Each structure stands twice: as C-alpha cells, then as structure tokens.
Ligand binder design. Sequence first.
Ligand SMILES: CCOc1cc(N2CCC(O)CC2)ccc1Nc1ncc2c(n1)N(C)c1ccccc1C(=O)N2C
Length: 122
Amino acid sequence: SMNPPPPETSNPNKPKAQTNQLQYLLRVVLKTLWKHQFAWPFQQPVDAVKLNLPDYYKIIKTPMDMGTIKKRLENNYYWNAQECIQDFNTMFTNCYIYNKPGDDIVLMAEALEKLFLQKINE
Ligand SMILES: CCOc1cc(N2CCC(O)CC2)ccc1Nc1ncc2c(n1)N(C)c1ccccc1C(=O)N2C
C-alpha cells in the first residue's frame, strides 16, 4: 500500500563536514557511477509499491540508493568518507540480500560495486 519515507539527507544535529576524501567521493566516485548505463535502478529509492515488493521494507532494514547518497554528499551530511562508503556498501548489499544470484539487477549491482572499488582505489 505505501512506501516508507526515503532516508534523511540533512540533519542539523548531525555535524556537517567536508573532507578531501568526501570531496573525491562526490566529484569523482559518485559521478562516475551515476553516469554508468547500469546506474538507473539505483538512482532513486526502491519503489516497493510499483515494483510490487510487499516484503522489501520488512527485510531491508537500512534502505539506501545513490539519489540519497548524492544528496547527502551535496548537503555535507557525512562526517567522513567511511560513512559514505558504508552507504554505498549498504546499497549493494540490500540488492544482494533481496535478489538472487544471477538476477540481472544483481549482475548490474556487482558491476557497479566493482567500478566503485576501482574508483575508491585512488
Ligand atoms: C527509474 C526506472 O526504474 C525502474 C524501471 C523499471 N521498468 C519496469 C518495466 C517497465 O516496462 C519499464 C521500466 C523497473 C525497475 C526500475 N527500478 C528499480 N529500482 C530499484 C531496483 C530495481 N529496479 N530492480 C530491478 C529490482 C527489482 C526487483 C526487486 C528489487 C530491485 C532492486 O533491488 N532495485 C535496486
């Protein structure tokens, strides 16, 4: 019947930071993934209503997507780069937990994860 609210992208109790690694994650790592041909499923929250996934938000306890990560980065939401990296890992992990080995969406996530890891190697 209804999707939960997307994850928060701003929080005035949460100190704003921008570190040099966070600056790289936005301007290089997120930008590279965002423009990839496999990005489209991950550019917004999972729409469990439209995809007809009544159990998604029961199983996936920390939903995450790159639209949220982009906004977090743009809003200086993260305290350091490790917390941003954790969000990306959560995003890939959610897709692997909900879906099945060999599903196209899974194979897309694995390719983006590999790319992500290659880019965070600078
Ligand atoms: C922006 C446009 O988004 C979509 C368009 C279409 N279609 C449908 C069929 C029409 O004919 C044309 C368009 C289908 C899916 C998406 N979006 C989308 N968002 C998130 C997920 C995802 N798909 N996949 C594939 C998953 C499917 C099942 C369970 C989980 C997921 C999943 O883990 N993620 C990340």
